[model samples]
Target: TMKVINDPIHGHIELHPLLVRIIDTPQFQRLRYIKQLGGGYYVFPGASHNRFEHSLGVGYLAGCLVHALGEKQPELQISERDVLCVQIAGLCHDLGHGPFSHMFDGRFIPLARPEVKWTHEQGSVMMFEHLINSNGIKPVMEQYGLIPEEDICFIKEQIVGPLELWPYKGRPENKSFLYEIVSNKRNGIDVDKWDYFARDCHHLGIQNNFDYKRFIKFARVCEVDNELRICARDKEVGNLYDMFHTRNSLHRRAYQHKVGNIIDTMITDAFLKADDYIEITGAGGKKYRISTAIDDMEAYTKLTDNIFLEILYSTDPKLKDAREILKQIEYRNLFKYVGETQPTGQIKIKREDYESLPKEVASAKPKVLLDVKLKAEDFIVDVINMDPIDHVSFYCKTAPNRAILPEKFAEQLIRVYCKKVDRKSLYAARQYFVQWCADRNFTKPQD
Candidate 1:
């Protein structure tokens, strides 16, 4: 059975019955409430699309590429069952995303539960299993000619790529190309990246086209270094580069936009303030605070952007401080951005080991000038920047294009922001950011 659906980006799409069944459960539909771009709608309103549809496009794109290779290169042995597994993997990939998506994980969780190493990827796997069991999807899966034992494992591996040395229980080594479709571990190319770039760019109104449909038309599976992998047409090499450019463009324009980052910072501050006060109850009948919901999917499912309103409307004295922060967002009282710069050369800092806080002495007692500290704990540094195209297997009319590059491959830019609205804070933030950049022993990238 197929469910017909129409989407602005992917156009007509029909999901397999299993995927449809998963979507029907409250778990997957939770994505409908989760924004695709996190707090991005605050900056680019049209990015209002949610994870629900993006997951749909990813599922559809997976089938598109898998089927193309199946029909075009029958020797690759892509099967009817294989296509469903790949599509199922794509659909369930984002099920674990929390309230404002990455904001919940990237911003809130790290600080809230620093003791636990958690991630949305791990959440998806957990959620997928709960979704399967809670909804009784295993029976339905087998009903569709899928062996729940193997295919489900296949589906999970698709969502989380396999280890290099492990023997795959879901697939044989000859069917290795299937692993690369949903998420390419070896090469960066994958259907997930393809759909996200096209869908996000369309929402942001970015004009650079990556033309993934053409990629599907030309994609083929070939044995390289004794392993089968998906390769693109060499003629589409320019197309591949544009795909990467589209990624960078999305990052620069919306995903990493200055105002958007400020909004996330502001909203996360509100979340931190409201963390303990707001509570969600799980299937086990236990209450979990907002930040603690990740520990229980039943509770986490109920968490969403609505928490913003829950805080915005509550008159509880405990929520008072949190409410004001959200009010600033409504009134545009955003965190003042300080400055941005790139290290002259590459420097990698471990997230767990990195720390920074600028403080200075300030106290007045006649001319004594008593030593005191003004700590700007609110000032933050966001690091990023990517050139991105790498090692995607490609071929001329027949064979031999692998791991290509662009004019430049990598760049890192650091942005500083001050959550404090006090006039003095912005000035101090700028100076601290300067020292922060200089203290790193900066170097330049190869030109």
Candidate 2:
């Protein structure tokens, strides 16, 4: 008899007979220790989770979502095969992420772009390709009578975007809507964001109280103009609205809380300064170096409320004012929320100055390094509008004529962004124009 994995949120996730064999593989086993949010624990104490657990959670959610869709739309009648594909994709979604989830992704991006470097999605694809090409994994797939290559490709496209099979292949004019469903955030609620909200809620102890029930009920797979549309129901609009806002609110209220922000900054700066060491000894290998020598844990354990306080307190005298600032954070350190608008416009500040002001404003000789107002429309997801003829995802039943972004939907997103900005309280704390404790509301160099 096979064993069931007990999950706090989902209860118990049953292992598929064939999938169980895949789970036993080395590649999958490695996920047991891979934390889901990498550095997210810096903000949420409950975020010290691994990819293995998240992957399982995702698999469970995939099953639920697919089954629900099957019930709602009998026409598509998603086969057991399709369900398996979705679940498998969910399980392997984050295989390529490095040690701290995406904490150090910025560090990796420069290396990945314009060269052989890769993002987590790309890494996952490459890893799967590697596993399939190997004699070891090939046998496992063969044993299950599974086709790893096509399945991997399909899974990747689902999570990332559609794939071009041939070297010069182009999107079929008929399936223009496929891109809309797969590529854009508007396509449907994604497992990546959905799982995080649930997992984050569980760890934070205080739930944003998201309604997964409503989210599930609203989940649908309808075809319009011959294109498939996976959309939330209008009745569940409240759920959709709550889900997005709740997750982001956690970032605003808890995850990005003042203490959390301070520690995050300290730890983040420490890591960046120590990048040379990570390069030489591997990130995990050099857990103890200079100020961080006594720490062998990742930023996760090291930056915890208790550990960070302990280390800072113990090393206070020797660290000069650095320990003092950290101690302040340990106690009641935090900044105030200010304006909702982006730092742009008439009072414009340089990019570098804008970033430095929040932290440095508290120090002597306060300066307004960045002073500008930013417009929301300037930052739209241009990638989405690059092409619409063969790009917009439409209902599978709808005609090609209906495969474009309705002006109303685009306008709604703009409104949502403005709302998002208004809701981002912590961002206000960073603006020199309104830093409460700072002598002046601007960034200045240390005296």
Candidate 3:
């Protein structure tokens, strides 16, 4: 029997019997404990929604987009099995995210194990494999008129996309559009962004101008440069711009909120400190390192947003400082925003190169520098860079042979965050930061 889930973003998301079984598994259910917006909840209290519902929303949106395309273009031959696999892909997309979402994988892991490579998407594949096999989801798939091997591989491909280590070996001939539905790796326009943008705006009380329903309504599979791609009506190019603008607005106003970033940094620091002593109980009753949990579903399942609570309530003496950081967050004793600036030169640099400059600058400072009592650990440099897309074009209906090219847009800003509460310390930190910028030849912000 099909089950219906009432989602705030997408109304009445109907789940197939197989999807219902998949959602009911412990591995999938763990997403309920993982917040979608990491430390964003602290800044926007209403933004407390978890990945569980977000995944459901994405699944529902993915189904809607694919089904709409299939209905309008039957020649594309979007089969029932294809729809199911796409929806399942959307539902299981975020199954691998650790506690506090991106902070767990993005910040903590890089600092903890600089040599190790990891991502939540990689963990999603591990967790999805575990969920289907360990929870016996394959049997349910077979009963629901789906092939376990081919369809399962299709679902994984939709989640991680074909640019992965394990490419989907399914019927590769048609259905290029299907790959773009759940997670669009091509132009970064997919159902995943649609759901999160609308859902996050709803919770954060921000204005979102993008109308995804209209975009999907005009969505079509057309050939461009001899490649099958999902394209929309040329006139809808304005809507595409609105979508990217909404993304930029979200990043500036919410995702990269000053206070939220500080809290995330604090939480990340706490996790780094507790990582050495924190042992995760993985699958088969075997214990594993938290760092290696991304590679093992058993260990990954034991990882969730609850780890923050565990750290906050931990009585371990080794975790005392980590616990204290959480307490400070609870008490609203957050780091202060010292200043903001841009990269030193007019010369363009990769985001990674720009972000790495701060560390090099910090490392060069004298150990006994007393101008500001602020140590390297007390300061965080955030580099925000949005690469300029010089020529943005869409297939205008009037001009089939040519695309409508518009002016490009890009932005870059760097901000300094300091962990000082008092005004004197704050002033000293600003002076020290100014000197640091000068020492490193970084451009200081204008008055």
Candidate 4:
């Protein structure tokens, strides 16, 4: 039976039976515990939403836009079956996300498994296979007037997108625009972003200027580069830029918030320390270190933010150090924020450049007085790629070939945090930061 869910962001939206059935699976339900914004909840209490709701909203937007396109332009030959696959891809796009979502893969996995390049999207495809195979969703998929073989492959590809070798084995090249609906590797503008823009801004109590209603209604698949691509109408050019602007604001305001970033840094440190100590039993009773959960979906499904509490409350001496970090986080004793600076020109900054500054100061001063090392973090407006939005083309009734070139693709700023939270350590770190900024001809952060 089709079910209607009353969502705060999208209002009451009806779900297809297949969607409900898939959502009912154990694998999909794991999203309920994974926080959407990770450690941002520490800074903004309202930011405590999870991926479960966000995934559903993105799927809903996906279907809305696809159906709108087919109905408006019959020439494209879009069908109900194709629309369903797109929705399925959107719904399960974030299934691979664990615990505090991106931090699990972005920071923890990168640090824990420095050699292995892993991402949640890769995990989602693996999880999606296990879900459909283990939960019998493929049978229901057949009952919905769709063929499982090709469509299943279609949905998976929609999540990870196409590789560069040749034609994507999922859907044909003509239906390429379908890939743009979910992740939109082509433009970074997709329904996934649309839902989060409204959902996150609503929870953060911030203003969201980008509205998907008009964008979806106007966007149409047109022939470009000898293939179909989604394009906005000429008048919506300013609105398109407005969408990118809204995305950038959220990063600065909350995602990269000074206080929030440190809590994540703390969480990551705690995770790294407890990685081997906190073991999870999965897949034939095999034990996995906390970081190794990403390697096995069975273990990954069990990983959540709750692991933080598991280690925090443990009596084991091995976990005591990790436990102390959590206690310090709870008590607001953290890595002291020393200062920050941005590059003045085209001079490229390296990690060693910042690390050497502290060392330079360390050599000049007495051993105990100024021995503190600086932990420099570059908050370079990530999540979005560092490229001019013109990489993705849009239509203009007034002008056809014109493109908007951004003066600067990304903003890079280095934040200096004292590894130790003592007054002496903080003072020593600030001196190093001031010296670094002065030598580079950049203004020091407001101390």
Q: List the pairs of residues colliding in candidate 4.
A: none
Tens digits of per-residue lDDT for model 2, 1-447: 445889887787887755676567555655666556544565676777877788777767766777677777666656576666666667767655544455333322332122333456665665555444542665665455556655555666755564553221223333232223222445345665677678877877756656775666656655554546565554554565566566656555654454443343444343433333332231446544322321221322222223333445554344434455445445544222232222212244322232233334333222444333333221111000101212323322343223322211221000001111333422322343233223433232122
Per-residue lDDT for 232-261 in model 1, tens only?
A: 787898888787778767777887789898
Winner on lDDT between 3 and 4 is 4
What would the per-residue lDDT of candidate 3 be over residues 1-447, giving only the tens digit for each residue?
Answer: 689887877778788887788889899889999889999999999999999999988888888888988898788898888888888988889988988998777666766665677778877887899888888888878887789888877887777766342255654746776888887776677899999999999999998988998888877777666556777777677787788788878887997788887888789778877887888887677777666677678888878888899989899899898899899999988778878766556554343353354455445554335555556676766654442242223556665433334434545666777766777777766776677666656687554
**Best of the candidates, TM-score:** 1
TM-score of 1: 0.90
The deviation in Å at residue 410 for candidate 3 is: 3.8
RMSD of each: 4.1, 10.3, 3.6, 4.4
Q: Sorted on TM-score, highest at the top, how do the candidates line up?
A: 1, 3, 4, 2
The lDDT for every candidate, in the order shown, is 0.76, 0.47, 0.77, 0.78
lDDT of 2 at 331: 58
* Alpha-carbon runs more than 4 Å astray in model 1: 342-347, 353-373, 384-390, 398-407, 440-447
- What would the per-residue lDDT of candidate 4 be over residues 1-447, giving only the tens digit for each residue? 679999999998889999999999888999998899998998999998999999999999999999998997787778899999999999999999977887777666766675676789999999998889888988999999779998988898889876333357777777777888999877678899899988889999888887788899877777676667887787787777777778878877987788787777778778877987898887888999887877778888788888988988899999998899888889998766666666758465542243244444333333344554544331111111122366556766554423226322456665656557577666766666676566667665576
What TM-score against the true fold does each predicted structure earn? Answer: 0.90, 0.59, 0.88, 0.86
Worst 10 residues of 1 by lDDT: 357-366
Which residue segments of model 4 deviate by more than 4 Å?
Answer: 163-166, 341-388, 395-409, 431-447
